[PDB]
Amino acid sequence: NGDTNNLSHQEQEYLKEYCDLITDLKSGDLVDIDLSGSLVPPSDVFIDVRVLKDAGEIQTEYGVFNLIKDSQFFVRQSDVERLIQQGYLQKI
């Protein structure tokens, strides 16, 4: 959204300020769009998802999700797209 020992210090600085640039771009007039969003077209409105790794009751923008390991949700893809991206959820 926006190991490191491999990179040289110049590359580390480059990556840091490039992430800063990406966030600055995301903050502009394209705010309504999630520029660092998903590039696969939206197909289904509701999907079954499974919790892949246990975590607390994460409070996302769209709502509160009680991420119990080995529990399924029937939710809208748009809401849980970030959690799938990070790896807390799986589509199945």
Partner: protein, 566 residues
Amino acid sequence: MYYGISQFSEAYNKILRNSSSHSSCQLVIFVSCLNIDALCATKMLSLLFKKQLVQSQIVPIFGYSELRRHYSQLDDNINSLLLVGFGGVIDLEAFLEIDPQEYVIDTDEKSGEQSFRRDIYVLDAHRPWNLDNIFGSQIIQCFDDGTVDDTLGEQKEAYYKLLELQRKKQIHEYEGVLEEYYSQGTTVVNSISAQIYSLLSAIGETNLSNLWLNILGTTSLDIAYAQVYNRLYPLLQDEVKRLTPSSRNSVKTPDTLTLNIQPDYYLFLLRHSSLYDSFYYSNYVNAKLSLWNENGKKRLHKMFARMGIPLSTAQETWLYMDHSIKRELGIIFDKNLDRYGLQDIIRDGFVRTLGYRGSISASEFVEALTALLEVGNSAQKLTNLRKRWVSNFWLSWDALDDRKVELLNRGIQLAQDLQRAIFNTGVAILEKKLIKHLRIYRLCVLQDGPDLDLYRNPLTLLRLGNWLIECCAESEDKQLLPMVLASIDENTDTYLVAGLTPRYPRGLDTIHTKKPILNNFSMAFQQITAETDAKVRIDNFESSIIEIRREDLSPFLEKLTLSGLL
């Protein structure tokens, strides 16, 4: 409160009315981790809610401790909670520390009723109902199958009068009748999947997949509570006849789906193994022939020789077996089986075929699902084991989808492996004469078996228990005596005791066989645990299964024998 057979539509409409808003999820379902009937019922409910676009969450749950933890961890935005496969016997309001005042939203003096933020629905087939949930509470709503109205009038009267209250005599007699009601043992009287299918028929959403799931749920009770399956069979037959297209002259197509009522058999995975292995690894056949010793193998070989099936042909797999014998099997079996006492193998079951694929029966499907549940794959280790079983729940749930057939095949393979292991362990138990025949019950404790890691799962332990119950216990013309089976695990130095109800000779209709036999081990186990400093864990949903420490089993069993309430 309790919802009659006709009130299922009202309950469903309430759930839709309250917990249905595309903004957020407001429904949660708790399921018994190790109950196939609950698995199928929850699959049916999940499909039904998916059709109407109701956001939900499904949480597998092993034991009451996990139930309490998860309920405490529930958010306050959940309007409806669904419990499938448990909760009826315990006092949910007391157990979950539910204070009706805290959960109240609005109270109307004119109406005389109060509105509550949360609602809890109980889908349980166990008995007896806890009279507090049925009659006292309001947040708890119990899905009844007619028992409360058929045979609970006197108990209702007594409980209502007791709440309403020379008077000492009436009070005493009322608590006496209540205690008499609470004294009886626990049994299963119906199938949850049948209840959900009745709801679906009430709202008109029955199709072939729902009927398949209902059949799986109902047939999962055949092994233990045969008397429930025999009662529910006619309805399933009528439903299959009603749903099936009248004309079958059309040829098979890659999409045709068939659901027939063909002659099934009490054989282990007939269509996915050899005809020999189906007889060898069958509970009934081993019970009626004693295959665990050499004379049994000789008798089975004699039977096959008499039937006219070469040994090489019998050991061939089902698909490639000689087709003349496969076609004649019904004729060959019917004359030959009566002589060996294996006549009751003949039966009628449900077989489902998907175009151009192998046909599989309901019993084998249930066996595959159970095998996936069992072996699919200090307090820290216990929690890890329970987490692994919760994980296996989802493998078994996936195996229910026609797009996942590799999982079903994997389940059949695992089921064959597990039955082989159970056969070997039972052979070791019977050869050594490890079964002690006391006057109150039978006992069998495993201490040094070769495959003792398998029996940490209650399901595998119950599989072995059923195997033992059928062989040399159902037969031999011995008196019906309940059995206790225990197993050890060095990694945690504790026992997993499991009382088992006796079973009448299979397929022997009689007035005494008509009467059901209850399981009293829950009451005795709880009494002994309370009286002694047992350290027993009674958190499992099946109250007959507990955990004991290595050094407490001897005192526990001594007190069990001296109790006399078994």
